[PDB]
Design a binder for this molecule. Structure first.
Ligand SMILES: [Zn+2]
Ligand SMILES: [Zn+2]
Ligand SMILES: [Zn+2]
Lengths: 64, 93, 49, 102, 214, 48, 96, 50, 511
RNA sequence: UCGUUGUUUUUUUCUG
């Protein structure tokens, strides 16, 4: 099911707090991070135990 | 700007047939041209077949018959089988 | 004169005793009110009546 | 700490009497002047304590005309007015003294 | 012509991160000194200019371009609230944070220090330097009844009287001027040197006694 | 001992709640039983 | 009036300020302070925090038991005596 | 399955084909199944070539 | 000595020089109680004068300082406070002085002391009781909760004997609800409960065979294996130490930005420390932690299997009492940390101007003295500014209405269970109380039962070093856990000391 | 010369 989450994670490119949305999409183990200012997209598979923070750490590692 | 292509979709299809095979950019453009021309051909065939029967809308059967007309025997039959299987899966589920 | 005592006094129905026991033998007081707004803001000066 | 009236640098009087103004010793002579001159030039009252580490591209210091002066604790406002002799000497020396109280 | 120095997008931005109450100047000093010590190293502090204003107590402003520089500047300080309660400043608002913002002889001012605090007075002369301001106070003299003070045992006030002063308890230098214990009494009003920090010239509402006398 | 100590408080609380529930019921001259608003509870106190 | 918030006498001469007196004086100070921001640099963040502070003292002086939020205190550390606290409870006016 | 591609078990986006089909001036109305069939046929042809 | 050093640094630049200021704590020196009269005269104290003059029978404390400096380019007796001295204790004047002089000293030879004196009042400490630390206990939850059995444990250091941290396992779910019986363990400084196998793998045992080796020791008991299997299945998303640790630290209750690099290090720290600290706090011992976790989980499920009654909380053998010693220890520790912080802050604010601190204006003896005096006088056990949420009534006036009352008042106990929610279990006399606390004596009213008085032959353990016990055991075939195997060591006997497993022995009868 | 006023706040141990 589609899950909207205006979580307060900090973005790296636009560097705007609470501009990061960690949508949760469990149907096919797919994880999207939606940003509001620079509107970048991050993809990552999400397991049963995955959490917005898990996607955030994956994205942080990806950025560098 | 936002000039959409079929780069990533062709990449995924390639990954599921030959997963360890790369490609150049010009081959990607050739694939885009082939796919776009085939899309235009099938859409035009559907439009003409709709016009011949004076039907103002398109269903999947028009695309099926267009694929039959365009492609030869074996290839058209295989495309028909794949399209029928995909459509039935999309219908039941 | 705890609550339960108040209830016991009610039980016997001794109204006037309860009334005075909570006014006269305790913190009685007088005030003035305005009959229009019904508040307690009247400025009363008794010696000036 | 007392703030130089010309450049706005504020330092305790010990440095002023030992090493002078880091940026106005050449025009004010705080180190080798009587304590009255140091006091008058370096007023105690101050406002707007600004810490500076860059002065080349220092827009904030660029407002305070202290781009050429070394970065440091700069008082945006300095109360009191300089004695007549110090102001006259500063004007005579080719240095434009503008009070920072406004 | 300071107006030529108007800010714009070109100037590095500023972030205000909350810091411990009363230790804001200490935080400013820490920023400055760590910036000095890390200069030239492979991990310098990427800041341009930082400030704190008296009105903006508890608020630390640093000029930079990336929040990482601000975090580095505040990182390692116990004189700061650990939270990154930072915020941005508008283009027009940038000059506001750096905007810094009436004492005349003959106008009535009050005292707020010493044993005569709470008494209206008139300035007599402001020092040439501008550090001590002379005043025209009302003497509070017991005429030597309890000489053997504090701001809680001061008796009533009265104009100095040469006759009473001579009767009950001394030098005359002029007609109407009397020097008593280092204090100056002119026409029954106390003259003394007063620090400018001990007095306020604004925010005075005259009192009933002042109306009756003044 | 513990039993008595606990029981007394709860019984007192129940007593308070009951009294503050039924403190305004009054047998009116008509023989009805009405609370403050005049709402009728019993048409004849105890039906006798 | 003072009756509602009389001045306690800790020991004979020295009279302490009832909690309501402190709270009212603090609200008065905060209200004056808001009145002083507009005349000078008020960068939309001093305004916000200061007005929220004023709202906070007003709310506490009106009630000091708001859920999910810390509780205003005296310098003694004891929580303040808001009017709601006065009225409720057995010790409150109705039952006291 | 949220996306229609996942509902179809394919890889070519049915959504983009349907979008372009609306702006195609080919017929007044577009069905919901014709794009899936076209996507499947295009996928098969592309796999055959690849 | 718990905080045996203060260290400052100063890589001064303007010319880079690294200056490190240090303060090294030394011995403590204690004196018999004394007065410093405002006239400046001094003299030895005796309690009677204190009782008469509203004094405080206390002795100053002297601590040995040491100021050492470390600079690179690349201390004496200090009065810290006066501790009240309990009458007749070894440090009280009256422990000596014969029987005759007592009469001269105005002291009844019958009075047994045991109480402090403050401002002329005679205050005594009432022993508090708390559940023993470093012990597992299993508690069943209520009907309306997915939690069914919880095996909690609190970890406290042997040294000091002060609370450190706890950790709980919640046997989530119900029977045939939520698929299997999911088990998740709560760890210190984490923002969510965690699957057990995840922490197991993060702890070092990545493969599941070792996990089932440690948690189970009856292979034929298939039911426990199959009902813990559901947890095994959900932990297959983790296969190595690193991903497990990163998963752990990801909810490490820290801020955002630690990213994976430092995340696994943070997890390694939080598993090296803060977790079962009473066992150890350094690296290279997570084998012991694994073994303990396995044993604890095994016990928790055993209670979940109804193979053993759920642990009794009222079992007095698990109860512990705290006399004046431990309590004054805690209060002194708090005040000492406050003093040390004050000294450090003064050091900072006095060496920036670069003046050799006097060590005297820096040390404010008023901190410890005032704090102890207030705590004993009011009983609000803690710092004064934190009166609320502070254990009250720890110290009480010594009731001298009759000699028997005085005696009883001294051998009193108490339970700080509060009176919010009546319940009955804590109040009711329990079998284990036989001969340890009086059965007949107890107050009336709301405190009935919660206040207990020591039996006539009661004695309280003061604590003894455990090292000789370890030395002896090793002599007698104590087998460390490292040589532990389920099938082989299914008959040997486990050994616990002070609530921590230490090894194995196969013939414990002779031991 | 009638007149003539005496704290709060908590905590505690108790009584029925
Ligand atoms: Zn962004
Ligand atoms: Zn009215
Ligand atoms: Zn200068």
């Amino acid at each position: 099911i589609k899950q909207k989450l205006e979580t307060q994670f900090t973005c790296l490119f636009c560097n705007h707090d609470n501009s990061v949305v960690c949508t949760l999409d469990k149907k096919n183990s797919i994880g999207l991070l939606e940003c509001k200012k620079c509107n970048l997209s991050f993809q990552a598979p999400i397991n049963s135990l995955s959490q917005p923070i898990d996607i955030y750490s994956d994205w942080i590692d990806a950025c560098e | 700007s936002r000039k959409e292509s079929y780069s990533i979709y062709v990449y995924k299809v390639l990954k599921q047939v030959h997963p360890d095979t790369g490609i150049s950019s010009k081959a990607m453009g050739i694939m885009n041209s082939f796919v776009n021309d085939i899309f235009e051909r099938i859409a035009g065939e559907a439009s003409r077949l709709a016009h011949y029967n004076k039907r103002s809308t398109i269903t999947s059967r028009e695309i099926q018959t267009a694929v039959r007309l365009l492609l030869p025997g074996e290839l058209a039959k295989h495309a028909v089988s794949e399209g029928t299987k995909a459509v039935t899966k999309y219908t039941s589920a | 004169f705890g609550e339960m005592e108040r209830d016991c006094m009610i039980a016997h129905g001794a109204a006037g005793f309860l009334k005075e026991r909570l006014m006269e033998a305790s913190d009685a007081f007088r005030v003035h009110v305005c009959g229009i707004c019904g508040l307690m803001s009247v400025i009363a000066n008794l010696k000036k009546n | 700490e007392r703030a130089c009236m010309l450049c706005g640098i504020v330092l305790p009087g010990r440095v002023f009497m030992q090493n002078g103004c880091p940026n106005c010793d050449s025009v004010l002579n705080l180190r080798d002047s009587d304590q009255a001159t140091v006091n008058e030039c370096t007023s105690s009252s101050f406002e707007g304590l600004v810490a500076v580490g860059d002065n080349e591209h220092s827009w904030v210091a660029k407002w305070l005309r202290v781009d050429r002066f070394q970065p440091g604790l700069y008082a945006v406002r300095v109360d009191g007015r300089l004695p007549s002799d110090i102001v006259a000497a500063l004007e005579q020396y080719g240095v434009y003294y503008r009070p920072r109280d406004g | 012509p300071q107006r030529l120095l108007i800010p714009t997008v070109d100037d590095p931005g500023i972030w205000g991160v909350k810091v411990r109450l009363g230790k804001e100047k200490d935080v400013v000093r820490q920023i400055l000194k760590k910036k000095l010590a890390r200069e030239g190293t492979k991990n310098p502090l990427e800041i341009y200019s930082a400030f704190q204003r008296d009105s903006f107590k508890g608020h630390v402003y640093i000029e930079a371009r990336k929040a990482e520089a601000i975090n580095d500047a505040l990182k390692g300080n116990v004189n700061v609230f650990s939270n990154n309660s930072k915020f941005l400043v508008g283009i027009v608002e940038y000059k506001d944070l750096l905007r810094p913002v009436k004492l005349t002889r003959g106008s009535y001012v009050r005292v707020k220090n010493g044993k005569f605090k709470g008494d209206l007075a008139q300035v007599d002369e402001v020092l040439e330097n501008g550090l001590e301001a002379r005043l025209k106070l009302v003497p509070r003299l017991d005429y030597g009844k309890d000489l053997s003070y504090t701001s809680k045992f001061r008796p009533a006030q009265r104009l100095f009287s040469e006759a009473e002063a001579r009767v009950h308890e001394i030098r005359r230098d002029r007609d109407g001027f009397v020097t008593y214990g280092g204090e100056e009494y002119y026409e029954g009003f106390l003259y003394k040197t007063f620090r400018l920090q001990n007095l306020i010239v604004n925010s005075i509402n005259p009192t009933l006694n002042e109306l009756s006398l003044f | 001992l513990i039993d008595t100590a606990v029981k007394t408080a709860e019984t007192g609380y129940i007593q308070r709640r009951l009294v503050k529930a039924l403190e305004d019921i009054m047998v009116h001259y008509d023989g009805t039983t009405r609370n403050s608003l005049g709402d009728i509870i019993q048409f004849l106190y105890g039906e006798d | 009036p003072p009756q509602v918030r009389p001045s306690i006498a800790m020991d004979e001469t020295t009279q302490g300020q009832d909690d309501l007196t402190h709270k009212l004086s603090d609200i008065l100070k905060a209200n004056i302070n808001v009145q002083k921001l507009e005349m000078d640099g008020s960068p939309q963040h001093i305004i916000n925090e200061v007005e929220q502070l004023l709202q906070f003292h007003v709310a506490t002086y009106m009630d000091n038991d708001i859920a999910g939020q810390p509780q205003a205190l005296q310098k003694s550390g004891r929580p303040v005596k808001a009017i709601r606290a006065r009225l409720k409870g057995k010790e409150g006016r109705l039952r006291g | 399955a949220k996306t229609r591609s996942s509902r179809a078990g394919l890889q070519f986006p049915v959504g983009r084909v349907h979008r372009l089909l609306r702006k195609g001036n080919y017929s007044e109305r577009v069905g919901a199944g014709a794009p899936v069939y076209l996507a499947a046929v295009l996928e098969y042809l592309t796999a055959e070539i690849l | 000595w718990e905080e045996p050093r203060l260290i400052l640094d100063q890589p001064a630049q303007h010319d880079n020089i690294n200056k490190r200021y240090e303060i090294r704590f030394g011995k403590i020196y204690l004196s018999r109680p004394t007065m410093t009269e405002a006239d400046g005269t001094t003299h030895a104290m005796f309690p009677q004068e204190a009782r008469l003059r509203n004094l405080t029978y206390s002795s100053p404390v002297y601590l040995d300082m040491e100021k050492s400096m470390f600079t690179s380019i690349d201390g004496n007796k200090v009065h810290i406070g006066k501790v009240p001295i309990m009458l007749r204790s070894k440090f009280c004047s009256l422990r000596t002085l014969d029987e005759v002089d007592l009469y001269k000293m105005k002291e009844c030879p019958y009075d047994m002391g045991g109480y402090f004196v403050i401002n002329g009042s005679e205050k005594v400490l009432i022993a508090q009781e708390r559940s023993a630390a470093n012990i597992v206990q299993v508690f069943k939850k209520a009907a309306p909760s997915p939690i069914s059995h919880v095996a909690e444990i609190r970890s406290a250091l042997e040294k000091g004997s002060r609370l450190i941290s706890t950790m709980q396992i919640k046997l989530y779910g119900r029977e045939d609800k939520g698929t299997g019986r999911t088990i998740k363990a709560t760890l210190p400084y984490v923002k969510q409960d965690i699957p057990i196998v995840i922490v197991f793998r993060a702890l070092g045992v990545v493969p599941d065979g070792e996990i089932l080796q440690h948690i189970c020791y009856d292979e034929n008991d298939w039911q426990m294996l199959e009902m813990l299997k559901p947890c095994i299945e959900e932990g297959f998303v983790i296969q190595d130490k690193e991903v497990a640790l990163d998963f752990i630290g990801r909810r490490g209750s820290a801020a955002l930005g630690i990213r994976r690099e430092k995340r696994i290090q943070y997890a390694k720290d939080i598993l090296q420390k803060e977790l079962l600290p009473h066992i150890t706090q350094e690296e290279g011992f997570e084998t012991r932690k694994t073994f303990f976790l396995g044993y604890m989980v095994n016990r928790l499920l055993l209670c979940a299997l109804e193979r053993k009654d759920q642990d009794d909380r009222d079992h007095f053998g698990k109860k512990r009492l705290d006399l004046a010693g431990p309590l004054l220890a805690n209060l002194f520790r708090i005040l000492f940390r406050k003093l040390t912080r004050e000294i450090y802050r003064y050091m900072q604010r006095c060496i920036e101007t670069d003046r050799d601190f006097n060590l005297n204006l820096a040390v404010k003896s008023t901190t410890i003295t005032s704090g102890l005096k207030y705590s004993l006088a009011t009983g609000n056990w803690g710092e004064q500014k934190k009166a609320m949420s502070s254990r009250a009534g720890v110290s009480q006036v010594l009731n001298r209405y009759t000699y028997s009352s005085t005696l009883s008042h001294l051998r009193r106990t108490n339970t700080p269970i509060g009176r919010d929610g009546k319940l009955a279990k804590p109040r009711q006399l329990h079998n284990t109380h036989w001969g340890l606390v009086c059965p007949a004596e107890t107050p009336e009213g709301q405190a009935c039962g919660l206040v207990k008085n020591l039996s006539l032959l009661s004695g309280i353990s003061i604590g003894s070093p455990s090292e000789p016990i370890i030395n002896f055991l090793e002599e007698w075939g104590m087998e460390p856990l490292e040589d532990y195997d389920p099938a082989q060591h299914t008959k040997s006997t486990r050994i616990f000391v002070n609530g921590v497993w230490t090894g194995i022995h196969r013939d414990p009868s002779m031991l």
